[PDB]
Amino acid sequence: HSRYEHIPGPPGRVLQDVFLDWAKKYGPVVRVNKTSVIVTSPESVKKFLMSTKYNKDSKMYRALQTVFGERLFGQGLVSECNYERWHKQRRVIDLAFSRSSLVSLMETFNEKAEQLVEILEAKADGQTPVSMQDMLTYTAMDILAKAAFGMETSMLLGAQKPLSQAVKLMLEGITASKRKQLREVRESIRFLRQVGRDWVQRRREALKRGEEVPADILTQILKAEEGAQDDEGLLDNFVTFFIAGHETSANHLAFTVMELSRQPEIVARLQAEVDEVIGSKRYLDFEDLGRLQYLSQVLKESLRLYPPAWGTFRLLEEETLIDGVRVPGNTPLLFSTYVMGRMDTYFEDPLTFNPDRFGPGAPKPRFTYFPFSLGHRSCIGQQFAQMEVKVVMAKLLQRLEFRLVPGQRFGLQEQATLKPLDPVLCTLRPRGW
Numbered sequence: 001h002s003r004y005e006h007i008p009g010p011p012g013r014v015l016q017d018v019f020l021d022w023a024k025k026y027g028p029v030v031r032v033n034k035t036s037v038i039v040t041s042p043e044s045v046k047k048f049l050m051s052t053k054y055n056k057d058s059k060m061y062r063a064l065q066t067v068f069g070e071r072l073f074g075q076g077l078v079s080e081c082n083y084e085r086w087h088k089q090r091r092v093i094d095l096a097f098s099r100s101s102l103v104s105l106m107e108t109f110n111e112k113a114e115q116l117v118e119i120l121e122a123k124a125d126g127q128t129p130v131s132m133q134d135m136l137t138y139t140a141m142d143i144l145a146k147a148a149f150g151m152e153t154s155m156l157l158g159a160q161k162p163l164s165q166a167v168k169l170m171l172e173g174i175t176a177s178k179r180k181q182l183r184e185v186r187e188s189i190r191f192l193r194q195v196g197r198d199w200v201q202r203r204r205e206a207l208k209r210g211e212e213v214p215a216d217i218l219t220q221i222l223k224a225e226e227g228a229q230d231d232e233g234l235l236d237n238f239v240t241f242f243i244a245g246h247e248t249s250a251n252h253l254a255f256t257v258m259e260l261s262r263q264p265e266i267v268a269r270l271q272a273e274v275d276e277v278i279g280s281k282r283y284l285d286f287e288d289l290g291r292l293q294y295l296s297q298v299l300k301e302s303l304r305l306y307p308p309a310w311g312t313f314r315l316l317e318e319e320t321l322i323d324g325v326r327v328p329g330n331t332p333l334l335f336s337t338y339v340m341g342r343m344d345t346y347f348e349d350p351l352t353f354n355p356d357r358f359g360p361g362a363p364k365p366r367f368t369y370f371p372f373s374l375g376h377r378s379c380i381g382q383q384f385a386q387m388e389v390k391v392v393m394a395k396l397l398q399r400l401e402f403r404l405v406p407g408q409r410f411g412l413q414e415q416a417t418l419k420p421l422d423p424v425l426c427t428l429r430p431r432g433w
């Protein structure tokens with residue numbers, strides 16, 4: 001008998017959907033086959049995520065650390081599982097995500113969002129198909145590169161297609177872990193790290209010549225590595241931020257645009273809100289963001305049904321009773337905001353898209369909703385992400401109407417993160433048509 005055999009479990013669709021079916025059938029503690037245990041009670045979410053006693057399970061993060069023998073995220077901020085090592089770097093990099101730091105990024109967010117809208121407006125003939133997944137990804141990449149690194153990827157101009165291909169193949173590599181695929185994945189990872197080395201060299205050379213370098217994420221990434229023996233830790237975090245800083249944001253934007261294409265009444269309300277708050281202004285100030293209350297709620301509801309980062313793992317070190325189930329020591333505990341978001345025990349009519357769930361008067365979900373995770377290992381980029389997505393969405397809503405091309409699906413794919421299966425192909429018209 002397996003050490004886990006006694007635990008309840010089985011004897012456009014994703015693995016997370018199978019997990020949801022099993023959680024509904026088998027209850028709050030379910031074995032899935034490494035063997036992990038999916039824990040879906042809010043009591044468990046609170047117990048394990050809100051304590052520094054419980055740390056990430058390194059075995060479950062190996063696929064981010066190294067892919068086919070090529071160091072990827074290595075021991076960067078996401079994939080480092082040793083508390084003390086993580087804590088040291090977290091505290092330093094946190095400085096780049098202060099309120100004042102993020103306020104300064106509004107210029108970048110505005111400029112890239114405006115560039116996107118202008119590109120889209122020229123195609124708004126109600127006929128030309130536009131992949132909103134692609135366009136939102138390019139926007140997210142361009143935002144990240146500029147905001148975090150002071151680098152112009154110019155993906156919105158159709159530049160850096162090799163870099164684009166490298167990201168794609170790398171993401172495929174994470175999932176995979178024959179002949180040509182290994183070659184393409186390995187070279188793509190080395191490419192991304194090389195991008196890092198090139199840019200860090202440029203930064204250091206600029207600093208030496210006494211040129212102006214605005215403090216950014218890269219500043220703190222460098223700071224975290226002060227007096228390191230090599231640059232491998234630095235490049236770990238370069239790649240971590242390069243990828244994490246755009247991928248989930250892009251996914252979230254794509255899901256939101258996809259969902260809203262079948263929510264005309266919600267779209268009408270969103271259009272009205274932007275009209276009242278910002279009017280025809282070309283630029284959103286920081287104070288405008290807080291005023292976009294209904295948009296905030298829509299984006300929260302989007303993350304409930306469509307969290308790009310579906311959850312997290314913690315290592316259970318000692319045998320523990322969890323919701324009446326004996327769980328052996330040395331076991332990965334799997335938490336899923338995707339699963340809990342779709343369980344009727346936690347959310348009434350879970351498949352209904354209802355922004356009012358996040359309304360001012362509504363009881364806030366208690367440990368049943370965590371698209372940015374919870375506790376010490378929550379997303380460092382949460383406020384960064386929320387700001388940039390609000391800027392992008394507000395400008396789209398100001399200027400454009402979108403219709404999803406018939407045949408386009410609302411299904412998901414799972415490729416390290418969750419994202420729309422289809423390209424979110426739309427036709428566009430200017431608002432007032």
Ligand code: HEM
Nearest residue numbers: 077078244245248249252309312371372373379380381385
């Ligand atoms: C809507 C967009 C985003 C979502 C849904 C999201 C979600 C998450 C989640 C669920 C985690 C926990 C991951 C885990 O436990 O394995 C996480 C961690 C992280 N995210 Fe994000 N994220 C987003 C945007 C960003 C952005 C914009 C950045 C950087 C600019 C970023 C960088 C990170 C980093 C570095 C971590 C690791 C934090 C730590 O452990 O100290 N994310 N994010």
Ligand SMILES: O=C(Nc1cc(-c2cnco2)cc(C(F)(F)F)c1)c1cccc(Cl)c1
Nearest residue numbers: 060061064243244247248311312313416417
């Ligand atoms: O792949 C995992 N996490 C992941 C997170 C992010 C992220 C977080 N914040 C912003 O982007 C981005 C990525 C990607 F590289 F695909 F873009 C992957 C992973 C690996 C092992 C276990 C678990 Cl639970 C999750």
